[PDB]
Short mmCIF file of C-alpha atoms in Angstrom, two decimals:
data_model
loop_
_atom_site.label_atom_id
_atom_site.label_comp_id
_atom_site.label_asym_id
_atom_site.label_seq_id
_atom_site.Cartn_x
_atom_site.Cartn_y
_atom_site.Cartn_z
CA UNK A 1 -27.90 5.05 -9.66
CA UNK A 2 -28.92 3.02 -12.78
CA UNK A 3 -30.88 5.87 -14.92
CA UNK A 4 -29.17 7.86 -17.54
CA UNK A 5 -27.93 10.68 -15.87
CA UNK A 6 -30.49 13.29 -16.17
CA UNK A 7 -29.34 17.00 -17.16
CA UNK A 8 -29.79 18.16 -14.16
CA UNK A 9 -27.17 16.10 -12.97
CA UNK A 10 -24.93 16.32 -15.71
CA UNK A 11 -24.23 19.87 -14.80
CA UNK A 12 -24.06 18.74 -11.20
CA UNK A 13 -21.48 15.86 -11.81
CA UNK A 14 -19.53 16.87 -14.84
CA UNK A 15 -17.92 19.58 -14.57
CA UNK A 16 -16.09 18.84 -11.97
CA UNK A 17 -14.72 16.18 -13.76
CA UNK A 18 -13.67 17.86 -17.29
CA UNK A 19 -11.49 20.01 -14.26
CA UNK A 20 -10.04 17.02 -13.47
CA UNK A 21 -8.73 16.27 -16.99
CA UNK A 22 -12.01 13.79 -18.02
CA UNK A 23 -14.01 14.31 -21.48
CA UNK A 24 -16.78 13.49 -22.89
CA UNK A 25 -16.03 11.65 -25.87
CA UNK A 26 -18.21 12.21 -29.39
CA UNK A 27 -19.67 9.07 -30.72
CA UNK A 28 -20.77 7.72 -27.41
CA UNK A 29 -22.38 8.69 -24.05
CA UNK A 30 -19.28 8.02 -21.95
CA UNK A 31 -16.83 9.72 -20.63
CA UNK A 32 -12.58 9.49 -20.77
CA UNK A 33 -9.22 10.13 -19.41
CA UNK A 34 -5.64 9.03 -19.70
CA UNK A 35 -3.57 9.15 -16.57
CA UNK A 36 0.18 9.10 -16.57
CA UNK A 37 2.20 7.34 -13.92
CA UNK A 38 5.91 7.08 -13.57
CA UNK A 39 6.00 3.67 -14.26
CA UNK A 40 4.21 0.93 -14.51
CA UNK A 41 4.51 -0.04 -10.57
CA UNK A 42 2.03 2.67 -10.25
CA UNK A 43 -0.32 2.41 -12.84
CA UNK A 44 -0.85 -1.31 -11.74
CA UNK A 45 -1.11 -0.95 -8.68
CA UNK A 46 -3.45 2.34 -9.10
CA UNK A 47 -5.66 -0.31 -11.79
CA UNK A 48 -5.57 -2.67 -9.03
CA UNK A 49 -7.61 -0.17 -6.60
CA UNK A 50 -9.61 0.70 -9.20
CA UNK A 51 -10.46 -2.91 -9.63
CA UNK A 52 -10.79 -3.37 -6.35
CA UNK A 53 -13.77 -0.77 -6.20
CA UNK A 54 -15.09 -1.89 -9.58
CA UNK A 55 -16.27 -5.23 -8.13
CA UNK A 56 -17.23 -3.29 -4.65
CA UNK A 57 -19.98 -1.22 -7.02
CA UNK A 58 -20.05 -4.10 -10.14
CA UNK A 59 -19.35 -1.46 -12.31
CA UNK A 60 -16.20 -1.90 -14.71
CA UNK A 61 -14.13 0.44 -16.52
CA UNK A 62 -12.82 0.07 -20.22
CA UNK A 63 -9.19 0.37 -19.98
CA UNK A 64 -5.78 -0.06 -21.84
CA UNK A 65 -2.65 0.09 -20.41
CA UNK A 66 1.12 0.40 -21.83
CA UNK A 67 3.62 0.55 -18.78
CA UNK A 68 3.34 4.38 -17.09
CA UNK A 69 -0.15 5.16 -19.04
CA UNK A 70 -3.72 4.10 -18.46
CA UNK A 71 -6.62 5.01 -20.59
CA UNK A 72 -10.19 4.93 -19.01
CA UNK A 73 -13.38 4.90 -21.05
CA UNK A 74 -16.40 5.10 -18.56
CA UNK A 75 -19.98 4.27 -19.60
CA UNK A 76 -22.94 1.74 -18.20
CA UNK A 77 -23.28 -1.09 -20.90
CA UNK A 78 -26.55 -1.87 -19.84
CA UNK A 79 -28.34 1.04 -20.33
CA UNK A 80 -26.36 2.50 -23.17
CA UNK A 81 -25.19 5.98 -21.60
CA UNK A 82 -23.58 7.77 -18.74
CA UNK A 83 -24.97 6.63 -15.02
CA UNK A 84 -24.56 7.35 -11.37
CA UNK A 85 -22.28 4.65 -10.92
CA UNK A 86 -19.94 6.31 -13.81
CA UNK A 87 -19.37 9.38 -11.84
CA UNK A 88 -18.82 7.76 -8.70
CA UNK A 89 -16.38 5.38 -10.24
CA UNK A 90 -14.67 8.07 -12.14
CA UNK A 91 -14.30 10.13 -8.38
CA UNK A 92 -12.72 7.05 -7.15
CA UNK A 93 -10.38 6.70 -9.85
CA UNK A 94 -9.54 10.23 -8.97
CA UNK A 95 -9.02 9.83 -5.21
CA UNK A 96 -6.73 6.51 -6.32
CA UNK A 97 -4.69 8.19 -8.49
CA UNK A 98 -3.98 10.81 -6.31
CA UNK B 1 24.03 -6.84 -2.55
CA UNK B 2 23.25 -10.76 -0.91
CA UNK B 3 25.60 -10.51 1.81
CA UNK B 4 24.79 -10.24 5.46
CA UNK B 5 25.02 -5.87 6.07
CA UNK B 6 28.53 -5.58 7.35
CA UNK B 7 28.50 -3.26 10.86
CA UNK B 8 29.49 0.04 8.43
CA UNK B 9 26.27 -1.03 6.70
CA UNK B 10 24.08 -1.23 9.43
CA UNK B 11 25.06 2.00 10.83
CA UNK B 12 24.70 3.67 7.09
CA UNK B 13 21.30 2.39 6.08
CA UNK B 14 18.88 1.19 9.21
CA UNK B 15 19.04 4.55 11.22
CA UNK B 16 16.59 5.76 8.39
CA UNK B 17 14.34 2.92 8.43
CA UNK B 18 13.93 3.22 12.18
CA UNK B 19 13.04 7.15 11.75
CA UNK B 20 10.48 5.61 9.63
CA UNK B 21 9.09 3.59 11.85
CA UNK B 22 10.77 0.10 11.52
CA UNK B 23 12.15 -2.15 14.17
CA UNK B 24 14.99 -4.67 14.22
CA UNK B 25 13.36 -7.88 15.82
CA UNK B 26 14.81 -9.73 19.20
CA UNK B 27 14.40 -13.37 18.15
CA UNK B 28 16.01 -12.91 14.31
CA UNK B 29 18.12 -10.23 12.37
CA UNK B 30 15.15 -9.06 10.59
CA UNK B 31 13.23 -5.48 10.26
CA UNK B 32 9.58 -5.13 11.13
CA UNK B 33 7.00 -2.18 10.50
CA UNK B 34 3.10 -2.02 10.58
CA UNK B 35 1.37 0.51 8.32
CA UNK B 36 -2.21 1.24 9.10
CA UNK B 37 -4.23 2.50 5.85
CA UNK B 38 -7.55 4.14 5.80
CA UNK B 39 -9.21 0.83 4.38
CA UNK B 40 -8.21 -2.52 2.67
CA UNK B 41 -8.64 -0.80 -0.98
CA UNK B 42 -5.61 1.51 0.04
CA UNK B 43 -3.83 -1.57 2.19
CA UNK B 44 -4.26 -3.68 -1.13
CA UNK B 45 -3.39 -1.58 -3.74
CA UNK B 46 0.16 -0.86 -1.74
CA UNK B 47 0.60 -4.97 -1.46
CA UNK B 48 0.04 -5.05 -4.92
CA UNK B 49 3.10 -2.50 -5.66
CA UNK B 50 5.45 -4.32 -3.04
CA UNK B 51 4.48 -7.56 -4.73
CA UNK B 52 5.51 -6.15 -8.23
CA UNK B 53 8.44 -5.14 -6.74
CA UNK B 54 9.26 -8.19 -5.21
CA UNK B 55 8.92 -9.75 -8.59
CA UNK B 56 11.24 -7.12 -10.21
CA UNK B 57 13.71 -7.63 -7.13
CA UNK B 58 13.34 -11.50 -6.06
CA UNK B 59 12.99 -10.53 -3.05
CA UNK B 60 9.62 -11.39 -0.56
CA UNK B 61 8.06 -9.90 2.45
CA UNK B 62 6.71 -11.82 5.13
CA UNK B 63 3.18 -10.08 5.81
CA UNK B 64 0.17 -9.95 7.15
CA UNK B 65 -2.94 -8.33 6.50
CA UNK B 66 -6.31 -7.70 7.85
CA UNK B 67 -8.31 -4.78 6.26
CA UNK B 68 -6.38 -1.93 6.73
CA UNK B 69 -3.45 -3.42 8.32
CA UNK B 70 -0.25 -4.56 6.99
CA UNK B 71 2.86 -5.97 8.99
CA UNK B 72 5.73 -6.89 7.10
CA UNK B 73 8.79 -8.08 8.28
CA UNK B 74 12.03 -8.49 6.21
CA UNK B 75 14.65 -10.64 6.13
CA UNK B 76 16.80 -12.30 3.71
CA UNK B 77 16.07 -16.49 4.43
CA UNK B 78 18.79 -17.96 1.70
CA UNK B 79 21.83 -16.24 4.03
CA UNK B 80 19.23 -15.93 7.80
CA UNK B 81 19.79 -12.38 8.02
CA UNK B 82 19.71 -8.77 6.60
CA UNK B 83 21.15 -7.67 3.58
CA UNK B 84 21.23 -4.96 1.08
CA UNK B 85 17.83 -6.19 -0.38
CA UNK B 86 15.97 -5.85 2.40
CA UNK B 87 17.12 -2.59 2.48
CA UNK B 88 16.46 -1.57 -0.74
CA UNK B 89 12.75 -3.77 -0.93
CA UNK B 90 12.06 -1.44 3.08
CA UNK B 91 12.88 2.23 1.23
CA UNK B 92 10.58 0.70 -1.72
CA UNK B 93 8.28 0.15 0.79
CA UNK B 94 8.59 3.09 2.44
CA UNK B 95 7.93 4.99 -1.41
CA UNK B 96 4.60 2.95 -1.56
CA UNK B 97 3.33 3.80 1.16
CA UNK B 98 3.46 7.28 1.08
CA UNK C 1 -25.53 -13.41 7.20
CA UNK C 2 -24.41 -10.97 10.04
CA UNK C 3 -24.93 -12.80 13.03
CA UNK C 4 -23.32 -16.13 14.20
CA UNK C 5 -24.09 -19.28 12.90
CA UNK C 6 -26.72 -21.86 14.83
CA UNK C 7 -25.67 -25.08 15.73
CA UNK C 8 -27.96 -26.16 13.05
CA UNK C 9 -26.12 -24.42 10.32
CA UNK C 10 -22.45 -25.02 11.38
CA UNK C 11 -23.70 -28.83 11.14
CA UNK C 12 -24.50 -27.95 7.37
CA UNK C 13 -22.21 -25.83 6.59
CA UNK C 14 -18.87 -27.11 7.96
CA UNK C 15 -18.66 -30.37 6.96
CA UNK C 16 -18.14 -29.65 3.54
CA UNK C 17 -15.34 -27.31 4.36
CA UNK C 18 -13.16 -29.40 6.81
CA UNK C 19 -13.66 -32.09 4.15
CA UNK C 20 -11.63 -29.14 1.67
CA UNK C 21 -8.87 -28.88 4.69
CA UNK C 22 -10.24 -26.14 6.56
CA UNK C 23 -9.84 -26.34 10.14
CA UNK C 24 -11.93 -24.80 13.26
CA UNK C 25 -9.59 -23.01 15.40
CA UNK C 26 -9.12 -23.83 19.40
CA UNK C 27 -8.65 -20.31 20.52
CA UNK C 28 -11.54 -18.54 18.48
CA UNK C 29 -14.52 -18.78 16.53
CA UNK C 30 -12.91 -19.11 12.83
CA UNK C 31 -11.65 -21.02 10.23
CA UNK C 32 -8.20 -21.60 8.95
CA UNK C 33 -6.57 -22.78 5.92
CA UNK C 34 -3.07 -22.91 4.61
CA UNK C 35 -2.82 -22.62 0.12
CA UNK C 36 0.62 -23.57 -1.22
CA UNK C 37 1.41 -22.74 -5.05
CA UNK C 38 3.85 -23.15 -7.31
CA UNK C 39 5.41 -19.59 -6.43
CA UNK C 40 4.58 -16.29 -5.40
CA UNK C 41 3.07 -15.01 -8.94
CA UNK C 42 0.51 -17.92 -8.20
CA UNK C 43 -0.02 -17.01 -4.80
CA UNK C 44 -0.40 -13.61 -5.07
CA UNK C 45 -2.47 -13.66 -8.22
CA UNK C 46 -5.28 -16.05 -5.85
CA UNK C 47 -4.47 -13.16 -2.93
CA UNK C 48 -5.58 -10.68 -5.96
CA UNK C 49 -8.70 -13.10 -6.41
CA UNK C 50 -9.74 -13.04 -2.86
CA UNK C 51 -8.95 -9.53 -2.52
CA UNK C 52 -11.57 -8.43 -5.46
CA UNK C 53 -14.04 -10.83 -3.87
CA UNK C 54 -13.69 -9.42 -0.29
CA UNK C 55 -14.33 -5.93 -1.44
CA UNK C 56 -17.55 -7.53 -3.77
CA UNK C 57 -18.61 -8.65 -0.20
CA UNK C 58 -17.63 -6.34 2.13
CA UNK C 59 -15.65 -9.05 4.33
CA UNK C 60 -12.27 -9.54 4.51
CA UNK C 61 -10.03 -11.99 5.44
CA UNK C 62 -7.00 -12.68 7.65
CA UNK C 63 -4.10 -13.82 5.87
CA UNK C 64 -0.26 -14.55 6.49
CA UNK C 65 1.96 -14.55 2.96
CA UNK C 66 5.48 -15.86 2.54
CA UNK C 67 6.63 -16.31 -0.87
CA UNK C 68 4.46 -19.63 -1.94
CA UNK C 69 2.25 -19.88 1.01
CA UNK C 70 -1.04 -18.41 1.99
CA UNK C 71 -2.53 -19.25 5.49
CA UNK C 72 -5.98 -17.81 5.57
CA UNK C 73 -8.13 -17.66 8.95
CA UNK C 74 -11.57 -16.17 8.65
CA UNK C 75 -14.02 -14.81 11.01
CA UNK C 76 -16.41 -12.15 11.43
CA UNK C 77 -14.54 -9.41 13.68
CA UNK C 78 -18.04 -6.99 14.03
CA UNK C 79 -19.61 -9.98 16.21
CA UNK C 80 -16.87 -11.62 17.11
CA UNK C 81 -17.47 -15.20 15.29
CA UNK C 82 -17.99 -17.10 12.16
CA UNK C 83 -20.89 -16.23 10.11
CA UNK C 84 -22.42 -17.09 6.74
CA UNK C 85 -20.00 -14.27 5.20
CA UNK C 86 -16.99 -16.40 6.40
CA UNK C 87 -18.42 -19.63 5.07
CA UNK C 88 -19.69 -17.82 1.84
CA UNK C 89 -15.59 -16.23 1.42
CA UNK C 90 -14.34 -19.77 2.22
CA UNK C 91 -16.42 -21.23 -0.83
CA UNK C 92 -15.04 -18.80 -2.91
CA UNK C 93 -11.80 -18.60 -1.89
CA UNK C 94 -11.50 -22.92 -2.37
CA UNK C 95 -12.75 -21.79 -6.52
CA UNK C 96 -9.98 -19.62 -7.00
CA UNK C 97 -7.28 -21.69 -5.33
CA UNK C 98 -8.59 -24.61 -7.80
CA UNK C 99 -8.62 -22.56 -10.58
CA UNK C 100 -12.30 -22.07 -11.25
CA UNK D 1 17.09 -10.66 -26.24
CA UNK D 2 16.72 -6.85 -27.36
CA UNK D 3 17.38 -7.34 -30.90
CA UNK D 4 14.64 -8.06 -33.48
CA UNK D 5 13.96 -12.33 -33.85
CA UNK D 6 15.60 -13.22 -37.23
CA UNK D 7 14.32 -14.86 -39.47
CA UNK D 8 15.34 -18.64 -38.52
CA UNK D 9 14.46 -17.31 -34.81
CA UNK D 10 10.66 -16.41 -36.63
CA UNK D 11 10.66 -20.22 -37.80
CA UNK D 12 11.45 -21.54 -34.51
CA UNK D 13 9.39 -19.44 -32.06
CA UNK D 14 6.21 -18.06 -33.96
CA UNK D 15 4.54 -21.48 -34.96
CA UNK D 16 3.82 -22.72 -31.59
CA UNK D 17 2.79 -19.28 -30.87
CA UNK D 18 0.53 -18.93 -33.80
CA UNK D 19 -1.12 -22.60 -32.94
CA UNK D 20 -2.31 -21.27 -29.16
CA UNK D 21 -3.92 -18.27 -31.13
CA UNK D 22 -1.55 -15.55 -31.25
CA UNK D 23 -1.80 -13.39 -34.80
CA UNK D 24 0.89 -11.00 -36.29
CA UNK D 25 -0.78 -7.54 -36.99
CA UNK D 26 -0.58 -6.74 -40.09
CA UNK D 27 0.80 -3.14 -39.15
CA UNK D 28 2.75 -4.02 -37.05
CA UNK D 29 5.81 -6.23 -35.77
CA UNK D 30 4.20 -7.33 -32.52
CA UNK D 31 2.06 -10.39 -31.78
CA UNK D 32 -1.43 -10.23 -30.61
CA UNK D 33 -4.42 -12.41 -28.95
CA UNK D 34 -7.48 -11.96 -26.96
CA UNK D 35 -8.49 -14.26 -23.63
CA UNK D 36 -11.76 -14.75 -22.28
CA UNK D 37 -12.56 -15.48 -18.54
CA UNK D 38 -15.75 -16.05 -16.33
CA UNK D 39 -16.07 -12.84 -14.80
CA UNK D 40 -13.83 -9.89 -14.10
CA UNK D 41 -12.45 -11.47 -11.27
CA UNK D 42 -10.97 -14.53 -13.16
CA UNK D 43 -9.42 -11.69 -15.70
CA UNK D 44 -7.79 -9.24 -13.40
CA UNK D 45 -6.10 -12.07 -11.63
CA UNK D 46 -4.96 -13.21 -15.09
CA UNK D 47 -3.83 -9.78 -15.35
CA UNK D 48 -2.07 -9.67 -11.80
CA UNK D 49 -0.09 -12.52 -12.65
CA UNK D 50 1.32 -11.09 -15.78
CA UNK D 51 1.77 -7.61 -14.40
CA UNK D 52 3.97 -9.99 -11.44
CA UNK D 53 6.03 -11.46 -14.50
CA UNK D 54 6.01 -7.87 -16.63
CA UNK D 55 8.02 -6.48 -13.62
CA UNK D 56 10.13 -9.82 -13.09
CA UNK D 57 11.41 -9.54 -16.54
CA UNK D 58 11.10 -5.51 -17.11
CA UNK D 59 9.13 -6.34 -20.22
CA UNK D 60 5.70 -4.66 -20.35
CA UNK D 61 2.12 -5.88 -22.89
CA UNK D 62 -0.13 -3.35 -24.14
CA UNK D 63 -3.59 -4.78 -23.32
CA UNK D 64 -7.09 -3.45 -22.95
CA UNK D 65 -9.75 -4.88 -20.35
CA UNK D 66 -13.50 -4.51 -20.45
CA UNK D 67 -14.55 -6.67 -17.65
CA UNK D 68 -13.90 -10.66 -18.90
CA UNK D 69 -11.76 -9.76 -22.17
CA UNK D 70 -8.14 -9.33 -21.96
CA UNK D 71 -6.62 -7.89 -25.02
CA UNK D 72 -2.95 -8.36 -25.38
CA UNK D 73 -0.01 -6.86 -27.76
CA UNK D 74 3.36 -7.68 -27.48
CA UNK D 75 6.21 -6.07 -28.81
CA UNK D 76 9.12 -4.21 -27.72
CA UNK D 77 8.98 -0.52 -28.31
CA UNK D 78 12.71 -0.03 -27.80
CA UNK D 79 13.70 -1.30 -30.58
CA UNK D 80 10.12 -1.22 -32.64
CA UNK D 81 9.36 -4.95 -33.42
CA UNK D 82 9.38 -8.40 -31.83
CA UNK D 83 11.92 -9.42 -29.67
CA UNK D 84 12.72 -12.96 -27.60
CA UNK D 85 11.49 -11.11 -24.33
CA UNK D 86 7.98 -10.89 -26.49
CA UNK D 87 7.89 -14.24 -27.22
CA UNK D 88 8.88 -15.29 -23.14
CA UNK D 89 6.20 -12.63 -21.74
CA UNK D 90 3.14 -14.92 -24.78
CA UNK D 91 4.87 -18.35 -23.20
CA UNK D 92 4.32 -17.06 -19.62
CA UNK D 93 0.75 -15.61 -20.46
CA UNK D 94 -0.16 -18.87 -21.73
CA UNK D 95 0.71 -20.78 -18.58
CA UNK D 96 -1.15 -18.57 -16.81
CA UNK D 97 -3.96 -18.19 -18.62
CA UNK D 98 -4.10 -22.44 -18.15
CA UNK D 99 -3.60 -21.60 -14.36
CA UNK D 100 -0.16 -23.19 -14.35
#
């Protein structure tokens, strides 16, 4: 889904993932959360799934890394706000880094 | 360690492996195992964490893939048979996988 | 393209690939292609390549790693034979092992 | 090394560094630069390869990706400035980010 999640969805999509440890963050329509890995074997090769399914949906995250921790801002560029496509991506990242 | 696994060795280290599921091949002193993932997202992500090891270890699997398959056999090529590292890169493996 | 190619476009199509070192295989319908590199952090950075483009497509490859080396053979397992995907993969797959 | 570059090691190291576009922050002891690519799939093997040479070397970047942009800090927070692993984790990212 390309439309700005309506609110409808919003309360059928995000709360589910504030449970999980996402937020929504204040100056933009996106949502966040920083995982923590052991190490850095981990959190690369959990970005690398992540990647993986990014270019299966063409639908990126904004990320940083530093060795065991990886920071993911989720938000669709081209329509300025949260999508579809951001939830599903953000459920992925879930499963992955399970 | 770089040396071939002395008998002691052997008995000490591969029992565990086979448990796991690996094989010691006919044809060379080398270890084999298959792991069957749920897709190649899963199958890629763990190549990706045996790779970084392999880095970190300078030490490299012989594999295959297709999908959701992965056969990797180990063996150490600069001495033509097993040694500690194999061990050590098969438990690693073993940790990824799981 | 899901279904095998015509005779029509594997006389297209092909050409331009063996002329890149791909090879038709005796035993099945698929190409093959072996990638040598400096190393294994080139090697598996291209694997990482192809791996993000399989999932883009949906259609993955077979492939055989040791250290430097990359043998690639690719063919369409849900019909049983090479079809545009696999020539489609193959063009990518000869960008990222050039670098482009 | 582990110990912060001195100040003839500065001299030596930075200037090459500095002329393939790396900047000191200004808050910081720790060299930065950004890289471009095509696509995502050109940066995230980019990344691959140093991720490959992070673990070879037990040296890790900070670095932020939004698909072709690859953000990268370097400095060692052990000892809370630059160190010669910094400045051997920039020399590999530049080969790689050349495709060498």
């Amino acid at each position: 889904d390309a439309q700005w999640l309506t609110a409808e969805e919003r309360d059928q999509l995000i709360p589910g993932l504030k449970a999980a440890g996402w937020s929504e963050l204040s100056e933009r329509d996106a949502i966040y959360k920083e995982f923590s890995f052991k190490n850095f074997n981990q959190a690369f090769g959990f970005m690398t799934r992540v990647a993986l399914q990014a270019e299966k949906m063409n639908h990126h995250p904004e990320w940083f890394n530093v060795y065991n921790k990886v920071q993911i801002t989720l938000t669709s560029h081209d329509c300025g706000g949260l999508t579809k496509r951001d939830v599903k991506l953000a459920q992925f990242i879930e499963k992955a880094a399970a």
